[PDB]
Amino acid sequence: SSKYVESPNYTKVEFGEHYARLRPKKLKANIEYTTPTGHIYRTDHKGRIKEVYVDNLSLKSHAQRTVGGEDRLPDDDGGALIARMFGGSKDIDNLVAQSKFINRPFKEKGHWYNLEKEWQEFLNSGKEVKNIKMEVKYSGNSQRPTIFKVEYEINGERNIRRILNK
Ligand SMILES: [Mg+2]
């Protein structure tokens, strides 16, 4: 399955108190927070977003410029894990350094954008996008994701996406 299961490896925090630092912005380590829209995030030991959960998807800056820190590449964008149109946050609690070639529409590319587009088409057509589980993998102490693992169910059918951050 890909449904959210509670875990003792993460301590839950009130939304608004999930930042360890304000200047510069940084998430607390090994925590779990639920956005007002209901999206659940988990951070690892270094304050990096590690897991994202959406029970039921629906249609509803300096952060974008600098997320990823010293590990951010020239062709990276500040990429939302959960798009704004799905109720996603525009801040660091939802942004990661994401290659523009998957974040934006690119011919024969734009995988993350294309995933979001598929989800829109499903929702618009009256189908449910359920139990989304994102796994964000990192390498060493790097703030920049290497690969995105996404699981989700479309009217019951489980789908799996592995998207390299290149
Ligand atoms: Mg995007």
Residue numbers in the entry: 444 to 503, 509 to 614
What does the publication say?
Toxin EsaD secreted by some S. aureus strains through the type VII secretion system (T7SS) specifically kills those strains lacking the antitoxin EsaG. EsaD is a toxin secreted in a T7SS machinery-dependent manner by S. aureus. Here we report the structures of EsaG, the nuclease domain of EsaD and their complex, which together reveal an inhibition mechanism that relies on significant conformational change of the toxin. The major contribution of this study is the discovery of an inhibitory mechanism in the toxin-antitoxin module that is based on a significant structural deformation of the toxin, where the central β-sheet of the nuclease domain of EsaD is split by EsaG into two fragments.
